[PDB]
Amino acid sequence: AKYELIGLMAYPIRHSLSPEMQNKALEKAGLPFTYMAFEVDNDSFPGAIEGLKALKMRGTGVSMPNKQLACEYVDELTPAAKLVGAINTIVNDDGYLRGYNTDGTGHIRAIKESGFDIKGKTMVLLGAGGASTAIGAQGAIEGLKEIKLFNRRDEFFDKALAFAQRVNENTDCVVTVTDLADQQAFAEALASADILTNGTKVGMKPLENESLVNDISLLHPGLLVTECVYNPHMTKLLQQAQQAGCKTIDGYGMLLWQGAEQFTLWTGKDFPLEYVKQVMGFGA
């Protein structure tokens, strides 16, 4: 009876790995919090937030299709989340709601944890969806000199443009958006890049048999390559990077660090990352 509730507001909720990860981390540390998932869409989201406040829930993770909508229900968003226009985390600080995007802080935390310094580097970002804008937003916020966002001409292209505009106009980070079709612009981008980051669905099943990088000669050792895809754990892009001497960061790195960021936001304590890693079976 002394535990606070932390939710997950989304629909569907069947395939989430947050519940087990947060709860196992919580048990390990013996903290007075319980994590539960709830089926919430755009129509019930407003009443769910009223519940969050009335019941004094500690917070809630947020997923499709409520991430953009949730931005309208918090009192405060971080500068990175305002760039993104979407949050996956809400923290209830005694009635005052703070909105965060731990996908961006997590991925950026995973990078730093490897001993890589973000400040002033050049990132070649593939995609402009939820993972990519969150990643680039935080990256800009933490000092990236430039971001060479490459996105095909699909339903996300204009999104890339506004994102670049927002990041450009609100940060000292220089973002350019280039059409993926221009392979030479891509070749020059990669050569000048310190980090290659895939935030697209390419690499994830069923498309598990492809990368946005046609030839490994396009990559150069010394380049750090990060992957958002965690299914499969070993993407084609990752294998290219490992077959080119590049240092790497897999999907599990972002997933675990992202979970950590949420955990600390809600508990104030450090996340037992190695433990959660083994317990969830992300080690093999």
Ligand X SMILES: NC(=O)c1ccc[n+]([C@@H]2O[C@H](COP(=O)([O-])OP(=O)(O)OC[C@H]3O[C@@H](n4cnc5c(N)ncnc54)[C@H](O)[C@@H]3O)[C@@H](O)[C@H]2O)c1
**151 lies in the binding site for ligand X (CB under 6 A):** yes
Contacting range for a copy of itself; rule: CB under 8 A; set: 2-10, 78-86, 116-124, 193-201 = 2-10
Q: Is 253 annotated as a binding residue?
A: no
Cα gap 115→118, rounded to integer Å: 10
Cα gap 13→9, rounded to integer Å: 8
Number of residues that bind a copy of itself (CB under 8 A): 31
**274 lies in the binding site for ligand X (CB under 6 A):** no
Nearest to 154 by CA among 135, 129, 132: 129
Among 20, 72, 154, 274, indicate the residue that binds a copy of itself (CB under 8 A): 20
* Pairing status of strand 59-62 against strand 89-93: antiparallel
Any idea which residue has 């969806």 for tokens? 129
Contacting a copy of itself within 176-235 (CB under 8 A): none
Contacting range for ligand X; rule: CB under 6 A; set: 39-47, 91-99, 226-234, 272-280 = 226-234
Instruction: State the binding partner of 3 from ligand X, a copy of itself, none, CB within 5 to 8 A by kind.
Output: a copy of itself
CA gyration radius for the chain?
A: 19
**5 lies in the binding site for a copy of itself (CB under 8 A):** yes
Contacting a copy of itself within 41-100 (CB under 8 A): 44-48, 50-56
Query: Is the link from the previous residue into 272 a cis peptide, with omega within 30 of 0?
Result: no
171, 201 Cβ separation under 8 angstroms:
no
Tell me the two tokens of residue 170.
């609100």
Residues at the binding site are: 67, 103, 128-131, 151-154, 201, 228-231, 251
